[PDB]
Design a protein around this ligand. Structure first.
Ligand SMILES: [Cl-]
Ligand SMILES: [Cl-]
Ligand SMILES: [Cl-]
Ligand SMILES: [Zn+2]
Ligand SMILES: [Zn+2]
Ligand SMILES: [Zn+2]
Lengths: 140, 19
């Protein structure tokens, strides 16, 4: 409901939708997300598939399950770009998953959940880092 | 709960490596 928030939801939603469907600051972040995020998905494919299964076994809602898991990642009080990029990446992996089970309409809310957790709970952190400009330079 | 803790820590460790 602000400019960090809508700019975050722009990047995340876009990345998740283009991953599922196979194909200034925001656009640079998206480029970085494609480079790094596609990497994470290749290299942690076995782990991601294991986690997806686990989520599905406990069928409590894919985007809600994602939300609980995502909150737990940050419970130790540490925040960093690795954590943020790994979660968006796992989000993309789950978004591809939702598309393969003819549940594309759940991708938009997935994207919102991730953004909510990010901007709502890590705002202070995101500001000190110069938002998505920090992200781009961290992985540059 | 334990399955969400396990998955969360699992993502945390790989994330901290990438970082
Ligand atoms: Cl790796
Ligand atoms: Cl938690
Ligand atoms: Cl890694
Ligand atoms: Zn599922
Ligand atoms: Zn927890
Ligand atoms: Zn790794």
């Amino acid at each position: 409901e602000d400019d960090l928030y809508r700019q975050s939801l722009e990047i995340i939603s876009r990345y998740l939708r283009e991953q599922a469907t196979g194909a200034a600051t925001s656009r640079k972040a998206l480029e970085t997300l494609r480079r790094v995020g596609d990497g994470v998905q290749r290299n942690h494919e076995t782990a991601f598939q294991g986690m997806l299964r686990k989520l599905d076994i406990k069928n409590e809602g894919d985007v809600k399950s994602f939300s609980r898991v995502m909150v737990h990642v940050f419970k130790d009080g540490v925040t960093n770009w690795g954590r943020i990029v790994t979660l968006i990446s796992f989000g993309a992996f789950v978004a591809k998953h939702l598309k393969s089970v003819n549940q594309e309409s759940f991708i938009e809310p997935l994207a919102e959940t991730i953004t909510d957790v990010l901007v709502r709970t890590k705002r202070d952190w995101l500001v000190k880092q110069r938002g998505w400009d920090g992200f781009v330079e961290f992985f540059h | 709960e334990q399955w969400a803790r396990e998955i969360g820590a699992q993502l945390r460790r790989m994330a901290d490596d990438l970082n």
